[PDB]
């Protein structure tokens, strides 16, 4: 089940793999944020496994945020 530290650990693991995969785009990695659930417990979203709690956040820059509407981002996340 996901923990409050698991989100940080997962984002760190993603950055570490990116560097290992030589994905050195420091502009994309900060725009990409991995979401998970709080260890405290929806309550976290009470994911039975960390895989269920994994989400992606993307920093849309202006003016392109007009294109990546919240519903579009939600569909992309689904």
């Amino acid at each position: 089940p996901p923990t409050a530290v698991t989100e940080h650990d997962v984002n760190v693991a993603f950055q570490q793999s990116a560097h290992k995969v030589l994905l050195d785009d420091d502009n994309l990695l900060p725009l990409l944020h991995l979401t998970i659930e709080y260890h405290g417990k929806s309550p976290r979203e009470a994911p039975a496994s960390g895989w269920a709690a994994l989400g992606l956040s993307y920093k849309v820059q202006w003016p392109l945020h007009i294109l990546f509407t919240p519903a579009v981002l939600e569909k992309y996340n689904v």
């Binding site: 793999s17 290992k20 995969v21």
Partner: protein, 448 residues
């Protein structure tokens, strides 16, 4: 981290294949002969770390091990412009330079003599690999060095790396040419034994098939060994493009090969290449569609494996994977699969679900591709048994003729008997029969 692949080039034929493979890989990745990425190779989209190691932030060195029992070939490789491309710490060369004398038993004994040095090299390369998938061995099964040393190396790798994957690029002897190595079937038998017992997948490279393709398809009147090695390196490059250009699927070698080998014995793969053109026929870029591509691929002239015509067994494909590179329309791929099934252009196993897998892959960005669309076919086809049956027949003919066994009896592995060759021949016969069964519906009950 990438799943690093160590390339092992063994004996004269294997070392030539390895050298041409490294040349092709360097050309595809835009790596200078010293292992440095060329300034024009600014497209960092290739995955060198799968097959190459970085010497610096810019210089990629192939994770390749060049192994010979004779110093002439290793020195000739070290005398090429690409001598500095490979990491020298991954190169183990036999000091005696005498080779194995085309004796498999001698090659195995030499491997045992170089066991410490070879395993030190292997361990050093493994420690330099963050997430090593396995080793790729390039060798001939007919000689002494590439064959005997290949069997010894396979045994020692299985003992030392029992949890690591072992893929081989095994150059099989030409079966249409009379081999001067009368003990080649013994060498071939030992290599097939080691692949059966200690390898998980054996990629068969038939020098007979290479010569046949060069003559009939490449319009090469006298195919050089170098030209065959360059064709093999091109084929390997096409097979590795999807590894070098990461995507949604087939992101690892084991993930790619898992679908092709249903059983540990069913590790005999057939190859196909696209676009297939005669050396003279490079000129006309045909706007081939995925349906047209598959149709040309379905022509035996476009398959990168020359399997004999078995007339007795209704040989069929066990599985097919098509890796297509270049501009591909998905609707054309769908129509291609539809037409192939409708036209029954391939016979599949009747005992289980079977299809032609299709992979679309990017081309290396550092290598300019002259072809809009390229393709690799990987297939498991029962007609490969006709090659295996021919190898078995040659093995039986040599054992029944005791041909060249006196030279093997000089080496400890074959000093007292050739029983390992006869057991290998029997295992290969059982393998041929099983491959024939896999062409049949009774494969569902095979091994029950």
């Amino acid at each position: 981290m990438p799943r690093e692949i160590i390339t092992l080039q063994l004996g004269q034929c294997g070392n030539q294949i390895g050298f041409e493979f490294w040349k092709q890989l360097c050309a595809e990745h835009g790596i200078s002969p010293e292992g440095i990425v060329e300034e024009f190779a600014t497209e960092g989209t290739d995955r060198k770390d799968v097959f190459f190691y970085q010497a610096d932030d810019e210089h990629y060195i192939p994770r390749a091990v060049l192994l010979d029992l004779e110093p002439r070939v290793i020195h000739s490789i070290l005398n090429s412009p690409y001598a500095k491309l490979y990491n020298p710490e991954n190169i183990y060369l036999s000091e005696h330079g005498g080779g194995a004398g085309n004796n498999w038993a001698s090659g195995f004994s030499q491997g045992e003599k170089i066991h410490e040095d070879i395993f030190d090299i292997i361990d050093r390369e493994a420690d330099g690999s963050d997430s090593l998938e396995g080793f790729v061995l390039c060798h001939s099964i007919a000689g002494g060095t590439g064959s005997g040393l290949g069997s010894y190396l396979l045994e020692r790798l299985n003992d030392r790396y029992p949890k690591k994957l072992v893929q081989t690029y095994s150059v099989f002897p030409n079966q249409d040419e009379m081999s001067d190595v009368v003990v080649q079937p013994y060498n071939s038998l030992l290599t097939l034994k080691r692949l059966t017992q200690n390898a998980d997948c054996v990629v068969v490279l038939d020098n007979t098939a290479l010569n046949r393709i060069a003559t009939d398809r490449l319009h090469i009147q006298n195919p050089s060994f170098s030209q065959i090695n360059q064709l093999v390196s091109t084929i390997m490059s096409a097979s590795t493009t999807t590894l070098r250009y990461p995507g949604y699927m087939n992101n690892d070698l084991i993930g790619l090969i898992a679908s092709l080998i249903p059983t540990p014995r069913l590790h005999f793969l057939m190859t196909g290449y696209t676009p297939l053109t005669t050396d003279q026929s490079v000129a006309s870029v045909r706007k081939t569609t995925v349906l047209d591509v598959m149709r040309r691929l379905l022509q035996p002239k476009n398959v990168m494996v020359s399997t004999g015509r078995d007339r007795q067994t209704n040989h069929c494909y066990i599985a097919i994977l098509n890796i297509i590179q270049g501009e591909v329309d998905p609707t054309q791929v769908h129509k291609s699969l539809q037409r192939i099934r409708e036209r029954k252009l391939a016979n599949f196993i009747p005992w289980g679900p079977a299809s032609i897998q299709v992979a679309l892959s990017r081309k290396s960005p550092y290598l300019p591709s002259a072809h809009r669309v390229s393709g690799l076919m990987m297939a498991n086809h029962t007609s490969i048994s006709s090659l295996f049956e021919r190898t078995c027949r040659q093995y039986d003919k040599l054992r029944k003729r005791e041909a060249f066994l006196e030279q093997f009896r000089k080496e400890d592995m074959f000093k007292d008997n050739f029983d390992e060759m006869d057991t290998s021949r029997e295992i290969v016969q059982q393998l041929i029969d099983e491959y024939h069964a896999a062409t049949r519906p009774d494969y569902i009950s095979w091994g029950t």
